[PDB]
Paper text:
The transitioning of cells between migration and adhesion is modulated by α-catenin, which links cell junctions and the plasma membrane to the [name] cytoskeleton. Outside cell junctions, α-catenin dimerizes and links the plasma membrane to F-[name]. α-Catenin is highly dynamic and functions either as a monomer or dimer. Here we report the much higher resolution (2.8 Å) cryoEM structure of human dimeric α-catenin bound to F-[name] and the 2.7 Å cryoEM structure of F-[name].
Author numbering:
A (entry chain H): 710 to 804, 811 to 871
B (entry chain A), C (entry chain C), D (entry chain B): 5 to 374
């Protein structure tokens, strides 16, 4: 599944960003964070087309409404990261973990929106599989690696 | 090929697969809608949140319960709740699993009929069934005899069952449950200067009630103790760091179950209702009903409610009787556990309402099959 | 096909192209007119200077700000400012670029309406939009949750936003900003014998304030330190070579933000205003508002204002709270950066006010589109 | 030997003697303190002004209300208010007259307890009593059945009474009243360019609201009418001779009573609150509650509020019902008139809290005597 692998490699990037936040990870300082923000935004735009296609192959008054909501959130988060990274790049070039916090917060927001988009896409594809167009996408609820939900604790 | 079990309570949805021993989805049965001004582009496209989605964002939402008192009042929000349950929480396709649903007794027939219709026509379930929650509690308790008191967010009901036979004339329903206690606690928290008005603040007060409230074994000595000392006062930290202290609101709120007149109701307490239900049963089964007082539901989860329950019923019943209150530790999910016991039963598989039968006989099939 | 972003502040014009990461025109928002006798032929034909043109020649001009407190008061001088911005500074043709403009909240509606009319009828812009400067600051900070304190030459405003939803009842505007601090510094510079009266000398005092003033973490110990020693005294050289020295005017001038009573105002300091805005928000979003205190604008650029800001809000808020003040190094242009983020957004392109809509609905379209 | 009746509202003090038909002291419930520099010798010895004393000099004072929302927040300023009431306005000696005081329902118990203590220990009253303001309004209206909607500066409350019996579970309190409407009017007056920020200017805006505002019978057609024409615009002259004009702020400000979401509150309008209070009452008394909708308090004094009130409740209630809104011309003093009716009653004279009972049982006597 293209959606799953794209979102999950972005999750790898977003893990490396939190690891820099904890102060011990594969990124030395702000410049690595700026580069990571740029690539996570690019992968978010790719995710944006994947969501666009799954939405376009869906009936109107269907799960496509939530999916388009999450896609618009994705659009803004990727755009904020790209301009903010360019602003941080210019600031570094002229003159900062505090600076890294804005990019990391935007990345957290983007990753949360991407998780929401992933589950929305899965629901849209499963619910309307043998509707026409979705079959061409060939997303048969198995390419999605959906675990069974784990049982609740009876006593808390 | 595996049945689903959705316990639609007034407060929480308990959903899972038949055969399992615990629900896999337990989320609030609320739908939230934004009530403020969306000022960022794309951040206001989602117009409705369901379940934990709404409790997470409840600071900008208006939370609504589709079910009051066990009757579904909003059929478009409940429909959203069910869509969430099937697709986001359980992640199944409803048209392959038969679904077991639960309902309180003495409930409008249109409720059950419209549940049948929504299942069979919006979710295309192959079969479905609507079971009474107290019978399911007795299933989960491993008995076939006993009187079950089930208290939830919306309704408290007593159903006496003997050897698998219910006595429907002795069933008692009382529209006083967890949500009424939450409202009463919001009301009596104003005596200390704490004002919780919003629906989100109602969720905060529900949390306060679950964490701090308990049932006094003897109400008047507890009031005297709270007046004399400050030993019963406990603190609670609000979501923004303010700390509130409540002394006798802790046992005054649950006392409304034994003194419904606290909230202006004329009915009898749950002990009196239980006794009155036992005394509408045949004299030969009363001894076994006294000894099996199954308590289920989340409103029976107050510390000390079983002790007070037994003390009051012992006062009411004859002195030679055998009063035992059965309060399992997991009784917050007894209805779901019994529903999964029943839906997995081998002898139950001819008792589903198949979609063929629905197509023959309309939604009215559910009153004669169930 | 590329949008313009003009941030019309009371003090400075920040103009540039959407998508860029910095304005390309940042000049004073002043119009100067000669006040002396032109004695050479042809040297007095130009009757008005705009921007850096006027600061260069301010020794023979009377400088006027078209905007006081965020409201445009001179609509012929502001019109000159905009003509300068488009044609001399940016060197574009306005009728091909949509223009994004900014405005403070709780501002007269005629301001926004006349901005819409001037754009669409004098500059023929294909489309335009008026955005709130604090929402743009939150765009530039890379967040969708947080309370933004924005201080400019004319107005200090707080707008609490949570998950992209603004709480307009908790917006607080305070007409105390950089120009009031410049006036207060001119007033208290007279205690040392320095008299700056002319508008040009007001620009000199603004420079003194930007270079030498700072925010004391604790005002009373700083006053004691300045009284005891001369360690806090710094010198400044005037345009004609005189040197002035100021000791406690350095931290007394910015203290008017935390003690507005210094200039005779009854309002509360920016810390108290921020706290009061947080406490008009829903209790469930207060924790996230405490942790995201975005500060933008050039009056928040004093050395030590974020430390004092956090100390005061920490004193006001509960002790278990998560007070963080976010003061980016580039916060003097956060409104412009957020405006360029928004104007370049793909989802924003249906939110422009096109000239067709203006022709249908007059200038009143701007209250319902924006 | 004659009782006193002090109606401590959030906005005004209504004081007088029991048996009379009108208060003898009606002054603002404010305490003002100078905020400027006293430069003349002996002119700055008085450090605090109370009542009309403060409104007279409010141009150099900071006005503070000891009561917000019906809860006394400053107990040293309220103590000054009471000293003024007894000694300067009424000119009595408090230790010879029993004093009747009033309080809103669902109000903190410490408020009532500290009022009891202040009376009995600072003013040495021989006896005192605290009565609910809606019961007093029903006394003044000459009825023993009806639902009272009392709106003051701080709180709006609905108390349904039938045959002299209150239904305390159906009492609804709403912290939205005249001061919130004054604040909303200050907020929406900025759209026309009028900035009132100081506490004195808040008193000016309260005057504007009292003189010019009214309740639109149908809000949307009134907004359309105000947009189309200028027939609804009225002028007002400020204390220094400036004239302001307001067109739809006149009916937008009182609309916050029927659409509390205007000021960001989630609650229901006063019509919806009244209906919801009627429907928590027993079905057999609802018909008589519909026909007796007593409105008291000064926030119910808008032109057209009774017509809109009846239109909305008629829309909510069944069509065969008997909706009458009772709005006496003197309803701004219904609470005081009812308090003087009660305090003069012959059967009430054993219901005072004597100082002997206070000495036995502390301030806690007031919850069981009242
Ligand atoms: N530990 C607890 N103590 C007291 N009340 C509780 C506790 N846990 C849950 N509740 C109450 O139980 C109700 C939910 O119980 P549940 O049986 O799930 O209701 P329903 O059957 O309506 O879903 C809620 O109103 C909640 O206030
Ligand atoms: N380094 C600084 N320290 C203190 N104040 C400053 C500094 N730089 C600019 N200012 C003040 O900030 C104001 C301009 O800030 P800006 O955000 O551009 O205002 P506006 O939004 O009104 O254009 C000016 O009044 C100036 O006095
Ligand atoms: N004619 C009027 N129209 C509208 N509002 C009024 C009028 N007269 C008084 N008010 C409002 O009523 C409030 C005072 O009413 P009152 O019943 O005396 O309040 P309280 O009981 O709190 O003293 C004030 O806030 C004032 O704004
Ligand atoms: Mg239940
Ligand atoms: Mg600005
Ligand atoms: Mg009153």
């Amino acid at each position: 599944n293209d959606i799953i692998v794209l979102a999950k490699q972005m999750c790898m990037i977003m893990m490396e960003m939190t690891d820099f936040t904890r102060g011990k990870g594969p990124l030395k300082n702000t410049s690595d964070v700026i580069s990571a923000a740029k690539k996570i935004a690019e992968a978010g735009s790719r995710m944006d087309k994947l969501g666009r296609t799954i939405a376009d192959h869906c009936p109107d008054s269907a799960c496509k409404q939530d999916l388009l909501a999450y896609l618009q959130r994705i659009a803004l988060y990727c755009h904020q990261l790209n301009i903010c990274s360019k602003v941080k790049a210019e600031v570094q070039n002229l003159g900062g973990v505090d600076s890294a916090m804005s990019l990391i917060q935007a990345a957290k927001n983007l990753m949360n929106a991407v998780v929401q988009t992933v589950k929305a896409s899965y629901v849209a594809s499963t619910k309307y599989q043998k509707s026409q167009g979705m079959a061409s996408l060939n997303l048969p609820a198995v390419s999605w690696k959906m675990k069974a939900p784990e049982k609740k604790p009876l006593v808390k | 090929t595996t049945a689903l079990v959705c316990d639609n309570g007034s407060g929480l949805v308990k959903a899972g697969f038949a055969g399992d021993d615990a629900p896999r989805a337990v989320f609030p049965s609320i739908v939230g809608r934004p009530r403020h001004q969306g000022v960022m582009v794309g951040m206001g496209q989602k117009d409705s949140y369901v379940g934990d989605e709404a409790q997470s964002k409840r600071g900008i939402l208006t939370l609504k319960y589709p079910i009051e008192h066990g009757i579904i009042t909003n059929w478009d929000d409940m429909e959203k709740i069910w869509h969430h349950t099937f697709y986001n929480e359980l992640r199944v396709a409803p048209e392959e699993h038969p679904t077991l649903l639960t309902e309180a007794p003495l409930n409008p027939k249109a409720n059950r009929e419209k549940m049948t219709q929504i299942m069979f026509e919006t979710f295309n379930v192959p079969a479905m069934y609507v079971a009474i929650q107290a019978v399911l509690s007795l299933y989960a308790s491993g008995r076939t005899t006993g009187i079950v008191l089930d208290s939830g967010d919306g309704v408290t009901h007593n159903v006496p069952i003997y050897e698998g036979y219910a006595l429907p004339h002795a069933i008692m329903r009382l529209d006083l449950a967890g949500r009424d206690l939450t409202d009463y606690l919001m009301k009596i928290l104003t005596e200390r200067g704490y004002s919780f008005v919003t629906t989100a603040e109602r969720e905060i007060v529900r949390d306060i009630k679950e964490k701090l409230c308990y049932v006094a074994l003897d109400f008047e000595n507890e009031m005297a103790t709270a007046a004399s000392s400050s030993s019963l006062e406990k603190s609670y930290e609000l979501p923004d760091g303010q700390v509130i202290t409540i002394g006798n609101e802790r046992f005054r709120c649950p006392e409304t179950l034994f003194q419904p007149s606290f909230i202006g109701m004329e009915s009898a307490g749950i002990h009196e209702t239980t006794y009155n239900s036992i005394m509408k049963c045949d004299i030969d089964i009363r001894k076994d009903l006294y000894a099996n007082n199954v308590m289920s539901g989340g409103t029976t989860m107050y510390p000390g409610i079983a002790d007070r329950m037994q003390k009051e019923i012992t006062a009411l019943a004859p002195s030679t009787m055998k009063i035992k209150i059965i309060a399992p530790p997991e009784r917050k999910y007894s209805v779901w556990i019994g529903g999964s016991i029943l839906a997995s039963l081998s002898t139950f598989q001819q008792m589903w309402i198949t979609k063929q039968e629905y197509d023959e006989a309309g939604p009215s099939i559910v009153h004669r099959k169930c």
